[PDB]
Design a protein around this ligand. Structure first.
Ligand SMILES: [Ca+2]
Ligand SMILES: [Ca+2]
Lengths: 141, 141
């Protein structure tokens, strides 16, 4: 019924958004996934395992995105002073600058799509779907 | 602010749901995408182009899913009596039976994740995000 429609509508929204975001982020020379790696590392270094798990993508996909971001000078691979094997992906100043640009593109698009909604409506939906996310995350992992 | 959180929460929900659905649908010998092909063809034959576009996946991905579904006897490729090139993917009786089983798995999971919400809340969110979907679809294509 409605509970099923809520989830399928959520899925359709994500697909359309991801498609438009890849298009708009293309001007920053980034794909939606590349942007996600930047968003994840913008607040602290992340392990490649974390990146693949958090955003549900293959390790080869993350390796591909990280390699690209590294070539573009947006992130760097940091190794432990002793165990150089344990690797963290750290964002660069340039990476943060590009990320910030990505955020504004995301922000602009989000305003457009949520247009028909008032600040109140927006907040109502957010509080609610936030409970859905908490549950699926508790169930899926 | 909140408009950005709404979209990112929607994205996180989809990823967690898609992951759990692939797990649960695995018992029906299906992946989330296979289920989507069945859902799309359950109400009428669909072109492979439509399938790839509607669910934002590559044509090679759809070809892979359709080939599998065909081997499993869940769908068939129908050719025009004259132009045998124009191909439609039609669901089979067995395909509909499996689809129906998939729906119940989807339905069960949707009830769980939307648990903290009452029928009213569920409906409120649905009416709202439905407007978001209408807009992004108008913008993305
Ligand atoms: Ca758990
Ligand atoms: Ca348009």
């Amino acid at each position: 019924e409605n509970r099923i429609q809520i989830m399928s509508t959520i899925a359709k929204i994500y697909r359309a958004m991801s498609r438009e975001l890849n298009r708009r982020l293309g001007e920053l020379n980034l794909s939606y996934l590349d942007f996600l790696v930047l968003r994840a590392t913008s607040d602290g270094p992340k392990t490649m395992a974390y990146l693949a798990n958090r955003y549900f993508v293959t390790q080869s996909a993350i390796t591909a995105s990280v390699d690209k971001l590294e070539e573009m000078g947006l992130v760097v691979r940091v190794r432990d002073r002793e165990d150089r094997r344990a690797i963290l992906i750290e964002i660069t100043e340039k990476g943060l600058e590009t990320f910030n640009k990505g955020i504004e593109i995301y922000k602009k698009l989000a305003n457009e799509v949520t247009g028909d909604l008032s600040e109140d409506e927006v907040i109502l939906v957010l509080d609610k779907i936030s409970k859905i996310l908490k549950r699926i995350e508790e169930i899926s992992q």
